[PDB]
Amino acid sequence: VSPGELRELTDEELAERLRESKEELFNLRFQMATGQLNNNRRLRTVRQEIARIYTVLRERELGLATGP
């Protein structure tokens, strides 16, 4: 996901997509452990996306770029 395209998410579906990012990092972690995923770049990407969501969520309630 991109910082710009995760701006149209207003206030709660942004947290809900943070939740599914956490869930998919979970499952991708599990397939790392069991060796059943081929592209291991995916958890780097997902971790970065979780960081992106957390960052944007922090800016919105610190007082920057808020809006639905």
Partner RNA sequence: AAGUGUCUAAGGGCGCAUGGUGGAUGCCUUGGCAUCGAGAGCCGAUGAAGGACGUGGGAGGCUGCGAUAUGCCUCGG
Binding site for RNA (CB under 7 A): 3-4, 32, 40-41, 43-44, 47-48, 50-52, 54-56, 58-59
CB of 21 to RNA, least distance (A): 10
CB of 38 to RNA, least distance (A): 11
CB of 37 to RNA, least distance (A): 10
Structure tokens at 4: 């710009």
Please count the other Cβ atoms lying within 10 Å of the Cβ belonging to residue 46. 20
Distance CA 21, CA 15 (A): 10
